[PDB]
Specification:
Shape: globular
CATH architecture: 4-Layer Sandwich
CATH superfamily: Ribonuclease Z/Hydroxyacylglutathione hydrolase-like
CATH class: Alpha Beta
Number of strands: 14
Number of helices: 9
GO molecular function: hydroxyacylglutathione hydrolase activity; iron ion binding; zinc ion binding
Function: Thiolesterase that catalyzes the hydrolysis of S-D-lactoyl-glutathione to form glutathione and D-lactic acid.
Catalytic activity: an S-(2-hydroxyacyl)glutathione + H2O = a 2-hydroxy carboxylate + glutathione + H(+)
Keywords: Hydrolase, Iron, Metal-binding, Mitochondrion, Transit peptide, Zinc
Strand content: 15-25%
Protein name: Hydroxyacylglutathione hydrolase 2, mitochondrial
Bound molecules: fe (iii) ion, zinc ion
Number of domains: 1
Structural class: alpha+beta
Distance between the termini: 39 Å
């Protein structure tokens, strides 16, 4: 399955999924129709679906337009059944959904919003995390709690290390600044951050990342690290969740 990024807006990533076996094609989080319209016009194919990770306008923007202007079916969470524009299929946690015979796992991943889901294609060793996990950060906790976000991050990190993560936004460079201000002694992070600056210096994406890397560099996945805790006056008595919420608060005000 081909996976084509679609940098909508200023730093949004939508993803066009191509089913090589046939002509099946869908789009993950179409911020707006225009960018998806451009690519499909090129591919020479039409749109069958529209899968949304969460309800925010920057992920459901082009929904109603693409659906009516393609006959595509909108696939997305059941919790946001009335918030996902034009939703045809409301999927639940652990639900399996077939994209042309390609299995998709539907994992609820609350935190950034209540109802957020991530989509894991085991056959492609790929998971679409929307705004739950980015490279070197997690989403802002608009609706969920620090505990809910930690649980959702652990579901994503319970997948194989080779699993590529297609962060929902190009935030990696900024995320690296805050990450290096907390754990400047982890060279895997110093190493990856430099490569991120290079890509961004020539306008290239830093996505997909991978479970392996985020475990080795994302502060929200390394909150028990001693240097990271002391850099944020995180008492030792704090547990996993508690340490994550302290980091999320600082990053927000960094
Ligand atoms: Fe977003
Ligand atoms: Zn969002």
């Amino acid at each position: 399955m081909q996976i084509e990024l679609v940098p909508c807006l200023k730093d949004n990533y939508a993803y066009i999924l191509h089913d090589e076996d046939t002509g099946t094609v869908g789009v993950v989080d179409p911020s707006e129709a225009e960018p998806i319209i451009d690519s499909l016009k090129r591919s020479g194919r039409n749109l069958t679906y529209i899968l949304n990770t969460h309800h925010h306008y920057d992920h459901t923007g082009g929904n109603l337009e693409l659906k009516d202007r393609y006959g595509a079916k909108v696939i997305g969470s059941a919790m946001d059944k009335d918030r996902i524009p034009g939703i045809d299929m409301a999927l639940k946690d652990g639900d399996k959904w077939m994209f042309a015979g390609h299995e998709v796992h539907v994992m609820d991943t609350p935190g950034h919003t209540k109802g957020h889901i991530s989509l894991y294609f085991p056959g492609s060793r790929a998971i679409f995390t929307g705004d739950t996990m980015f490279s070197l950060s997690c989403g802002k906790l608009f609706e969920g709690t620090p505990k809910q976000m930690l649980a959702s991050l652990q579901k994503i990190t319970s997948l194989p290390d080779d699993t590529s993560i297609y962060c929902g936004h190009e935030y990696t460079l900024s995320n690296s600044k805050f990450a290096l201000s907390l754990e400047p002694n982890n060279e895997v992070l110093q190493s990856y951050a430099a490569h991120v600056a290079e890509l961004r210096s020539k306008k290239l994406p830093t996505i997909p990342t991978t479970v392996k890397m985020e475990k080795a560099c994302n502060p929200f996945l390394r909150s028990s690290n001693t240097d990271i805790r002391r850099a944020l006056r995180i008492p030792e008595a704090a547990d996993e969740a508690e340490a994550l919420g302290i980091i999320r608060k600082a990053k927000d005000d960094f």
